[PDB]
Request: fold
Amino acid sequence: VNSFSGYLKLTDNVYIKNADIVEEAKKVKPTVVVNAANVYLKHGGGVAGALNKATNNAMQVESDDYIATNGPLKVGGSCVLSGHNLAKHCLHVVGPNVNKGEDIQLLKSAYENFNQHEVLLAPLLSAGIFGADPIHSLRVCVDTVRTNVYLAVFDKNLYDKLVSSFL
Ligand SMILES: O=C(NC[C@@]1(O)CCN(C(=O)c2cnc3[nH]ccc3c2)C1)c1cccc(C2CC2)n1
Reply:
């Protein structure tokens, strides 16, 4: 039993809710919140910009030190950093950005990072400003993640479409 509330159950291990991931994280304080990161950990907009803003830019400060030490992530890769005031940990995961020409096949590799964590609060990878089809992202999620994932979808219209079209 966990503290996530109001989710629709899609499969044995995948759950979905129309919610602002920032507000959901502040309420649940999950062990792991997933950020829709880029390889530079520049949290400018989308989910990343919102999460970072909620940390009063502490996420960005920590991220800049991480990059200075380690260099950029790989597309499809991830790193674990602090969750600040939102979660114990933040798993920064880089899905391919279609608006940069990146291989959508890397979306499965990106979701594989979730399997290293027993329970996660997450957005749909590569959705939103990353330019991929969110219906496809949900499909890859369900077919790749085996751990317990609670998906927050900000847009109510998109949420209803994801549920109604789910196979
Ligand atoms: O946001 C979208 N896409 C990006 C993602 O892939 C990564 C973050 N995603 C979220 O839904 C999300 C969740 N909580 C959040 N709190 C603050 C921000 C924020 C975002 C999915 C999105 C929104 C509306 C329509 C479309 C359609 C055209 C493709 N996309």
Observations:
- The first helix runs from residue 21 to 28.
- The longest strand covers residues 148-153.
- Residues 20-22, 36, 46-47, 50, 123-124, 126-130, 134, 152-155, 158 surround A1BKN (CB under 6 Å).
- The two ends are 26 Å apart (CA to CA).
